[PDB]
From Swiss-Prot, chain A:
Primary location recorded for the protein, binned into one broad class: nucleus
Gene: SLD5
Alphabetized InterPro entries for the sequence: GINS_A, GINS_bundle-like_dom_sf, GINS_Sld5, SLD5_C, Sld5_GINS_A
Name of the featured protein: DNA replication complex GINS protein SLD5
Annotated family: Belongs to the GINS4/SLD5 family.
Keyword Signal attached: no
Keyword Disulfide bond: no
GO cellular component: CMG complex; DNA replication preinitiation complex; GINS complex; nuclear replication fork; nucleus
Function: Required for DNA replication. Functions as part of the GINS complex which plays an essential role in the initiation of DNA replication by binding to DNA replication origins and facilitating the assembly of the DNA replication machinery.
Any Gene Ontology biological process: double-strand break repair via break-induced replication
Recorded superkingdom: Eukaryota
Curated annotation (Swiss-Prot), chain B:
Subcellular location: Nucleus
Residues of the full protein shown: 688 to 927 of 927
Name of the encoding gene: CTF4
WD repeats (start-end): 12-52
Record protein name field: DNA polymerase alpha-binding protein
Primary role: Accessory factor for DNA replication. It plays a role in accurately duplicating the genome in vivo.
Additional notes on this entry: Present with 3280 molecules/cell in log phase SD medium.
Curated annotation (Swiss-Prot), chain C:
Protein's cellular compartments: Nucleus
Stated family: Belongs to the GINS2/PSF2 family.
Keywords: DNA replication, Nucleus
GO cellular-component term (any): nuclear replication fork
Classification via CDD domains: GINS_A_psf2, GINS_B_Psf2
Subunit structure: Component of the GINS complex which is a heterotetramer of SLD5, PSF1, PSF2 and PSF3. Interacts with PSF1 and SLD5.
Record-level GO BP terms: DNA-templated DNA replication; double-strand break repair via break-induced replication
SUPFAM superfamilies the record matches: GINS helical bundle-like (SSF158573), PriA/YqbF domain (SSF160059)
Summary of the function given for this chain in its UniProt record: Functions as part of the GINS complex which plays an essential role in the initiation of DNA replication by binding to DNA replication origins and facilitating the assembly of the DNA replication machinery.
Name of this chain's protein: DNA replication complex GINS protein PSF2
Pfam families, A to Z: PSF2_N, Sld5
Gene behind the chain: PSF2
């Protein structure tokens, strides 16, 4: 019999502050779990901080001018500020642990990414000056007494490597979202399993093995194996 | 009680809701059955006779009944007051035996033919639009937006008719399809009906619809 | 800088905070429709356009904020009823490996609504408190069977709740990491 659902669809059809907070929640949750330091959202933070300032002035103006709407506005601003506070504290904690690694990544002239791409201006200031403070402390206290072959602080060639770096093979929990627009027919990686949902396929190279990541199922997976799909928002960390 | 727009309404001992339409015009005033509670519980129970359940009405808000769902021996509520429920009106068109046959987890609500659903929607849209129109014609808008609801009802009305029309075309009943085409309002829908007729491979009906569209375009130009 | 207990995981307070951003259906007891709310992380139209005893949808934290006073009543989610929970227990017993398809926030939302909104249910609350317990016990049996398949490569989970995952996270990931270290050391 004659289908018309498409005829009805074509007949029938004839950035926001809400979205930014969802992106902030996404960034916060991903930053907490992942082993590496993810790149800073430069644009989002500018817009959010401006909005916070304007809302604060509006609350003051209305206060100086029913109680309940003011209660909602005040506690909403508290809820918004808490997330940003937690997020920035986590990022600074990551910068403490990978300071020499980030410095070495910056000193490499052939690096595919610059340190200013990855970090915010405040983070750059913190990294630079904190490294000098720590360096001065150990340089005078310990290294002043060592012979010239052992006076380097970031030595790679010694019997133990003095530089730490992320564990790229850490296990993480994931939830498979698919492409964000619902465009299952457009995603080139998204093949299909038999009589069911679409899926992605990944190769785990130490073992020479494959797995199928169906939409909507949860997995415990190595970080490096799923890094690209995470960067493309095909999956989200639980 | 009176509706949220002053229509007279009453709930019968048969557990049916009746509303008086066209009361402003004595040669056109008429009583309309707009909702049967028993039929709703029958479908909700998966086609079962849960006579332990009773409905206690409260008030009518536009298209939706406010009511308490009472369970047990006594068919009326007690203290402290249980919370209310909300339920939409629908036209009485269905049959138990036919819907059981169409249907044929154990309590799952019975599945209905698309023809019945589209038919009921078109009737419900028509009645709702007429009552709202009469209200606006005499008493105007209270809030400044009810015309938008009326526009939505007209869209739903043509949409329901297009599904019924397409069924008639798929059955190749040109006579019934043409009779249905007269009842469509917007030329958007008539254009869709032309496409539907092309899919049905009915050039005679494409011709006669376009005759109607040309006639109605002339009536629109006049 | 960050506390030691927050290096790799979310505390239950953060889990509650995450769940609180979801929408919920309410009946207001006042009309706001013609000051205005002027929120910045949500829609603002719904709260500005409320009419008494007209159903509407808002974020859960504002819903609980209103229900603290007389101005609001909360509609329970449809899965949170005796009939549905009976069916889910039967599914759990029928399929001895699969987890039943409850929503990702079922534990958190049940233990919020039973405290803040004990008066707004239709079912007797002393039965719901029993059936929630039955579901959690059966799921714990199924979890204890699954911890015999920790391995060097991966694992699949389905319909396991957020709080249930967060409860287990530091054990699964640690033991799995050490099995990986032992295996790769033999390859190198």
């Amino acid at each position: 019999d004659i289908n018309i659902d498409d005829i009805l669809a074509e007949l029938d059809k004839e950035v926001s502050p809400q979205q930014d907070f969802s992106d902030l929640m996404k960034s916060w949750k991903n930053e907490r779990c992942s082993p590496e330091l993810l790149p800073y959202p430069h644009q989002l933070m500018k817009r959010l901080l401006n909005r916070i300032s304007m809302q604060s002035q509006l609350i003051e103006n209305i206060s100086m001018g029913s109680k309940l709407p003011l209660l909602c506005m005040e506690t909403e601003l508290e809820r918004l500020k808490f997330v940003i506070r937690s997020y920035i504290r986590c990022r600074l904690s990551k910068i403490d642990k990978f300071s020499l690694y980030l410095r070495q990544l910056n000193e490499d002239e052939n690096s595919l990414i610059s340190l200013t791409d990855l970090l915010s201006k405040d983070e750059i200031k913190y990294h630079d000056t904190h490294s000098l403070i720590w360096l001065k402390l150990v340089n005078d206290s310990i290294l002043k007494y060592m012979p010239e072959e052992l006076q380097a602080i970031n030595d790679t060639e010694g019997s133990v490597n003095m530089i730490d770096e992320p564990d790229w093979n850490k296990f993480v929990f994931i939830h498979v979202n698919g492409p964000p627009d619902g465009k299952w027919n457009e995603d080139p990686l998204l093949q299909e399993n038999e009589f069911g949902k679409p899926c992605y396929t990944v190769t785990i190279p130490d073992l020479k093995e494959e797995v199928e990541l169906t939409i909507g199922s949860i997995y415990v997976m190595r970080y490096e194996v799923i890094r690209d799909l995470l960067r493309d928002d095909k999956v989200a960390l639980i | 009680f009176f509706s949220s727009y002053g229509d007279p309404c009453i709930f019968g001992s048969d557990n049916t809701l009746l509303l008086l339409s066209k009361w402003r015009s004595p040669e056109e005033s008429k009583w309309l059955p707009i909702l049967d509670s028993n039929m709703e519980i029958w479908k909700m129970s998966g086609g079962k006779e849960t006579t332990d359940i009773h409905v206690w009405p409260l008030a009518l808000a536009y298209d939706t009944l406010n009511c308490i769902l009472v369970k047990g021996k006594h068919i009326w509520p007690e203290f402290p007051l249980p919370l209310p429920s909300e339920m939409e009106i629908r036209m009485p068109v269905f049959v138990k035996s036919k819907l059981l046959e169409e249907n044929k987890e154990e309590d799952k609500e019975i599945q209905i033919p698309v023809s019945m659903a589209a038919e009921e929607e078109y009737l419900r849209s028509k009645v709702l639009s007429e009552l709202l129109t009469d209200t606006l014609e005499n008493d105007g808008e209270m809030y400044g937006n009810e015309n938008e609801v009326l526009a939505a009802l007209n869209g739903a009305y043509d949409k329901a008719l297009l599904r019924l029309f397409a069924s008639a075309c798929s059955d190749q009943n040109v006579e019934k399809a043409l009779s249905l085409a007269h009842e469509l309002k917007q030329d958007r829908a008539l254009t869709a009906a032309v496409k539907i007729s092309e899919r049905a491979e009915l050039p005679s009906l494409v011709k006669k619809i376009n005759n109607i569209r040309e006639a109605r375009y002339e009536q629109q130009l006049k | 800088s960050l506390p030691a207990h927050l290096q790799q995981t979310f505390s239950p307070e953060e889990i509650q905070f995450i769940v609180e951003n979801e929408p919920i259906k309410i009946f207001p007891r006042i009309t706001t429709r013609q000051t205005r709310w002027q929120l910045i992380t949500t829609d603002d139209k719904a709260l500005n356009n409320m009419v008494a005893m007209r159903s509407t949808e808002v974020v859960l934290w504002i819903a609980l904020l209103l229900k603290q006073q007389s101005k609001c009543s909360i509609v329970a989610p449809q899965w949170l009823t005796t009939k549905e929970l009976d069916r889910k227990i039967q599914y759990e017993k029928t399929h001895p490996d699969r987890f039943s398809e409850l929503p990702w926030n079922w534990l958190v939302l049940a233990r919020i609504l039973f405290n803040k909104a004990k008066d707004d249910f239709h079912d007797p609350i002393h039965e719901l408190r029993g059936k929630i317990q039955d579901l959690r016990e059966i799921r714990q049996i199924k979890v204890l069977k699954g911890l015999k398949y920790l391995n060097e490569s991966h694992l699949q989970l389905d319909n396991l709740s957020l709080l249930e995952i967060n409860e287990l996270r530091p054990f699964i990931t640690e033991i799995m990491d050490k099995l990986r270290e032992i295996h790769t050391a033999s390859l190198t």
